Symmetry: C3
Subunit: 336 residues, 3 copies
């Protein structure tokens, strides 16, 4: 019902250690609380403390995130629901690391086994174990678009030029959802197809980053997975159940047509929590795509990412405030 | 009468080819049409198509531009009219290349013969052939100023510091024109003087680019040529006919006191085409200089430059829209 | 009474000489006038001329600045007054050079003898000569904070992370002054302590410059010196006299929450000279700190710094105009 909101804090990086950054963040997994030290040299006892559905401190690893947050959501996708997980937070804090992950250098690890892999690869792997281990007939289609400056780009298209644009339209079968005209949806026949698909997507992103200013922090990225499963009743009737999972990595929250989406996202959340009558979904590409995940029939989680350094105090607080409000968004989840 | 407007599209560059840029532009010289592919991955048949006075595709060369556009204008300068050609378009699309040209590397070519030379050098050469081949007594004076951030700089001054500023005043002999106080006008005695004059101007520009932020894309450049010719009537009377040619290379059109001129240019064109009563010439240095070329006694052409890449779709459309409106500007041309 | 305002013009630098910068500034020490050549190529005789309390031309040296401006102020600090000197001017013109100075390269000079040393080191040295040469018991405490984006940072704190923030509060003993909660005030026992203190402060600044965007030009720097002296009356009574000296190096004047202080400074000066009723001290960190120096019981001087190059004409004029107004600020100076 309420959307689930969790917080992940990344460890210090080398720049921060070189600069002797002190920590101002404290995670308590059991009480599910984050607590920010607030008063610098002036007031040593000051704190702001917030309660979330779950809390992940600096030493938390990609496997822990997946086990705690995604497994439950993945089961519900398998039972024929739509789900959305998204990452919100300041640039540099681990939205991408959490949602995609990285490759460990050289040969080192098989992609199914890279400890650095994030939610998207781990999920694609699990869909194959859980549904093959299980008998049952199924197909998996993925897609990956990016929104930048209110234009949409298709990272998995066979087209060789990233800058060729998609277009968006209302679904006549779902008052709350959209059709992306031109989107490539690639059918993923087994887990041995996965990596090449992602690698071509990554190569497409690299080109786009060289074409557009500050691409990697000003853009939103939407990875979707659609699964079709065959169910036979006890009467012997053959009916299909469809589950869809969107994995969204938002533009950096510090950025306030170039910020349109990140700004309409904020107004949308506000209009929902403060129960205002017209909710401005239409006003950005992002919120049209996410409309059903903010107040609709989709089950939603948010991963708020934060830095632990004293330097980013203000933005850290800002992310926590923003994400804590979002707990009061109520969805009405429903199978397809 | 109507001002003449033409379009030049440059070929792909190496960055674009490295990025597998697709083309979205199509020039048809005979029907005089440019046609932009408009719907990316979503709608393959979509186009916007526009008709101009002339159209130059990617494979068009500097010699072709000169033959088609300038010769006719040069004849009319020789017959004692004022003319203005200017380049309008997004940064990176060939305003400078078209108006000045480049030098081919090493020894390679004599400047009169460099295939890379643009309109200004080619014109200065022709003035000397056409008027020496012709008997007739004549003098040629040139000048070159730049407007940046509403300050005027004189690239041909003997002064060693580029940053010394010119000032502007109304001409008491021409309700539509200006005197530039302090401008150096250099007398060009033969074509063997030309290149050194341009080379010193280029060296002055190089310094200015290091002094002022983004100088080369935020500045307007005005090259003028003034020719005095001696005519004897059939009665034996000696009267002088003066022709003047301005060659303007505007700041890049993507830039929206720093954009004052490019912004007042837009309002001026608007006030003329939509027949509004007070036309705000006074409000920028550029439009004061160009006042007689926008709605006055000067004969004007505009060269709109565009990229062919899918990436620049929006600006490409924007340039074509802007330039197509300008066809409805009516001038009343007249000898001096 | 009136605040004292003086002008320092720096010599050309290598970039300017490489670019053949002409000069547009003329200092006349005896008549106390600066005079800016104003009309570029257009009008050679044009000038704007301004009178200040003192005037220092390009060839003036750090020792001259100190002798003329600081000695008098230092005597008055010793007699138990509060004084403030601050530097105002465009980035690149010598606020830091004037207020701190530089180190001559390699071994070269003892810090007490470096010809490049500015007002802060020279002053700390003199406090020790003048008060030891003199018998009399005394202690000296220094402090150094920086304001950036309305946050306060403490460069002399033992804390290893610069980004830990101070907080500000009204002094209940002085309607016109503030307490900085958390500020480290280091006791300086002899002149052999000085340099290490400054060197640690400089190392703290270096880190901050790497943490925050454009730190060195957008930040204000406040160095304070507090001196306690023991006086015995002729009756044999033991009373303490306190003198305080603030040495402020403002953010660059070309920058118009990031400009809040530099903007409220301007409004404050305006409200004083134009005698407006509510003076908006409260509205920035800087003006709260400086409140007593703008219209209060502190004795104030301003050092306006300017470039001599033709290129910076506009900002040069702007600094002179701004500083000339400030001569009409009246203070009511008083011992503690
Ligand atoms: N949880 C984490 N553990 C270790 N390193 C991390 C973590 N999160 C982020 N990083 C590192 O910080 C950098 C920024 O992460 P990134 O995902 O790009 O953040 P964002 O996309 O939010 O800007 C990357 O180099 C990443 O390795
Ligand atoms: N018509 C053309 N043919 C070949 N190269 C061109 C052409 N127009 C522009 N270029 C190249 O593109 C770059 C940008 O041209 P430039 O004239 O500087 O554009 P602008 O002044 O409009 O920014 C230059 O390197 C130039 O060689
Ligand atoms: N009076 C001066 N004499 C010689 N060099 C100077 C003088 N003032 C400034 N400079 C040089 O100019 C540069 C800028 O000085 P700086 O104090 O950093 O100016 P600001 O802090 O006003 O930006 C420094 O390299 C400094 O050496
Ligand atoms: C860009 C699509 C995507 C999504 C999720 C994970 C990956 C990557 S890391 C994404 C770049 N931030 C990937 C990296 C390099 C080449 C191919 C694939 C991926 C896949 C599997 C495991 C892993 O650790 C990383 C890529
Ligand atoms: C800057 C004045 C100007 C005008 C038109 C053409 C040129 C140049 S190229 C302008 C730089 N974008 C020129 C280039 C380098 C040195 C001297 C002259 C020029 C002159 C003749 C032929 C030619 O190909 C180029 C220069
Ligand atoms: C940053 C505090 C401070 C104040 C005034 C003067 C100095 C320096 S130069 C300040 C940097 N712009 C200083 C430079 C490097 C290392 C230690 C001290 C200083 C102290 C004494 C003499 C001198 O020439 C310079 C430092
Ligand atoms: Cl690291
Ligand atoms: Cl922690
Ligand atoms: Cl793992
Ligand atoms: Cl629609
Ligand atoms: Cl808002
Ligand atoms: Cl090329
Ligand atoms: Cl073509
Ligand atoms: Cl040729
Ligand atoms: Cl005038
Ligand atoms: Cl407008
Ligand atoms: Cl120098
Ligand atoms: Cl001088
Ligand atoms: Cl000295
Ligand atoms: Cl207070
Ligand atoms: Cl104001
Ligand atoms: Mg990212
Ligand atoms: Mg150019
Ligand atoms: Mg400085």
């Amino acid at each position: 019902k309420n959307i689930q909101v969790v917080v992940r804090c990344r460890p210090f990086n080398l720049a921060e250690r070189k600069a002797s950054a002190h920590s101002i963040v404290e995670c308590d997994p059991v009480r599910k609380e984050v607590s920010v030290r607030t008063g610098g040299l002036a007031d040593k006892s000051s704190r702001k403390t917030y309660t979330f559905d779950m809390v992940f401190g600096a030493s938390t690893k990609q496997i822990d995130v997946y086990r705690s947050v995604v497994c439950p959501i993945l089961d519900e996708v398998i039972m024929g629901y739509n789900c959305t997980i998204f990452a919100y937070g300041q640039t540099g804090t681990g939205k991408t690391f959490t949602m995609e992950g990285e490759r460990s250098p050289n040969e080192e690890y098989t992609w199914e086994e890279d400890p650095l892999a994030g939610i998207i690869p781990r999920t694609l792997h699990q869909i194959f174990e859980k549904l093959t281990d299980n008998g049952t007939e199924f197909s998996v289609k993925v897609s990956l678009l990016e929104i930048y400056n209110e234009e949409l780009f298709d990272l998995l298209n066979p087209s060789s030029d990233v800058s060729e644009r998609l277009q968006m339209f209302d679904d006549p079968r779902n008052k709350r959802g959209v059709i992306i005209k031109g989107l490539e949806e690639i059918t993923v026949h087994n887990k041995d197809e996965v990596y090449q698909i992602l690698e071509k997507g990554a190569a497409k992103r690299t080109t786009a980053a060289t074409l557009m200013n500050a691409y990697s922090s000003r853009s939103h990225s939407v990875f979707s997975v659609t699964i079709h499963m065959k169910e036979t009743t006890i009467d012997g009737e053959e009916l299909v159940k469809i589950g869809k999972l969107n994995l969204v990595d938002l533009a950096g929250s510090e950025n306030i047509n170039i910020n349109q989406s990140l700004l309409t996202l904020g107004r949308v959340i506000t209009a929902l929590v403060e129960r205002t009558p017209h909710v401005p979904y239409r006003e950005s590409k992002l919120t049209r795509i996410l409309q059903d995940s903010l107040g609709g029939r989709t089950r939603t989680s948010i991963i708020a990412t934060i830095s632990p350094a004293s330097l980013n105090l203000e933005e850290t607080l800002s992310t926590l405030e923003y994400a804590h409000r979002a707990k009061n968004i109520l969805n009405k989840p429903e199978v397809n």
